[PDB]
Amino acid sequence: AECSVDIQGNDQMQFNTNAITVDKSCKQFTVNLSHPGNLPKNVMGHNWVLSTAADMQGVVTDGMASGLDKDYLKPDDSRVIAHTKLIGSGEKDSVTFDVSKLKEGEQYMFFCTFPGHSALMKGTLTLK
Amino acid sequence: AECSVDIQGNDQMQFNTNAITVDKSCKQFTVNLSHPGNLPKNVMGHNWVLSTAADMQGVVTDGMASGLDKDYLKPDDSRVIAHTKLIGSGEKDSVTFDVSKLKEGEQYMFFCTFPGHSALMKGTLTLK
Ligand SMILES: [Cu+2]
Ligand SMILES: [Cu+2]
**Residue B70 DSSP class:** G
Of A44, A115, A120, Cβ closest to residue B39: A115
Question: What distance in angstroms lies between residue A121's CA and the mean position of ligand 1's atoms?
Answer: 6
Burial of A94 (0-12, 13-18, 19+ CB in 10 A): middle
Domain limits, chain B: 1-128
- B1-128 belongs to CATH 3.40.50.300: no
**CA nearest neighbour of B50 among B22, B16, B91:** B22
Contact predicate A82/A111, CB 8 Å: no
Counting ligands in written order, the one closest to the CA of A121 is: 1
Contact predicate A111/A118, CB 8 Å: yes
Instruction: Return phi, psi of residue B99, to 5°.
Output: -70, -20
Reported for B52-56, long-range contacts at CB under 8 A and 24+ positions apart, including other chains, are: B52/B79, B52/B81, B52/B106, B52/B107, B52/B108, B52/B109, B53/B107, B53/B108, B53/B109, B54/B107, B55/B79, B56/B109, B56/B111, B56/B118, B56/B122
Answer whether A120 touches B (CB < 8 Å): yes
Separation CA B76–CA A122 (nearest Å): 38
Contact predicate A33/A46, CB 8 Å: yes
Counting ligands in written order, the one closest to the CA of B86 is: 2
Q: Specify the experimental method.
A: X-ray
Estimate the share of chain B in helix, then strand, then coil, as percent rounded to the nearest 5.
Answer: 20, 35, 45
- Say which residues have a Cβ less than 8 Å from residue A25's Cβ, sequence separation at least 6: none
Q: Which residues of B touch A13 (CB under 8 A)?
A: 116, 119
CA atoms within 13 A on the CB side of A85: 9
CA A90 to chain centre: 17
Amino acid at A74: K
For A116, the closest chain B residue by CA position comes to B12
Inspect the interface and report whether the beta carbons of A116 and B11 lie closer than 8 Å.
yes
